[PDB]
Amino acid sequence: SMNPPPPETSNPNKPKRQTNQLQYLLRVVLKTLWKHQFAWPFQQPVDAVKLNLPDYYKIIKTPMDMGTIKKRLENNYYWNAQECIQDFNTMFTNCYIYNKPGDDIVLMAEALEKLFLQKINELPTEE
Ligand SMILES: CNC(=O)c1[nH]c(C)c2c1CCCCC2=O
Numbered sequence: 001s002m003n004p005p006p007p008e009t010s011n012p013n014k015p016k017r018q019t020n021q022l023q024y025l026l027r028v029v030l031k032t033l034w035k036h037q038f039a040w041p042f043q044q045p046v047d048a049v050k051l052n053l054p055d056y057y058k059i060i061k062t063p064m065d066m067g068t069i070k071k072r073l074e075n076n077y078y079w080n081a082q083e084c085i086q087d088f089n090t091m092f093t094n095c096y097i098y099n100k101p102g103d104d105i106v107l108m109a110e111a112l113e114k115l116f117l118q119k120i121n122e123l124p125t126e127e
Helices: 020-034 065-076 081-098 104-121
Strands: none
Touching: 020 065, 020 081, 020 104, 065 081, 081 104
């Protein structure tokens, strides 16, 4: 019933690089999803105490949310775009695994994932 510590967003010993795909992931992908009318449930870790979801972290073992992804993109945590794409996919999958079909939260994730998939389809070639 308690919340875990949040995912890691800072690790000085992880090697980092600034690349055009990672810049696209922040400037196009994250920003597009973050401003959406359905973004709010995904802008921060699930607070299972205040939301009264005592079994959430019993089921979800790799929590992920766009607040964590945003901080990671600010902190160069991902060496490559596939790592950040994986974090978005984990966020959507957690929602589909935990909830029931047709719940509001699932409809919201699906609308964000539709936009995510379209933006990833146009991920630029590495420079
Ligand atoms: C403010 N955040 C929410 O309301 C929120 N965010 C997520 C990803 C969920 C919830 C509660 C609905 C059911 C659980 C769920 O997956």
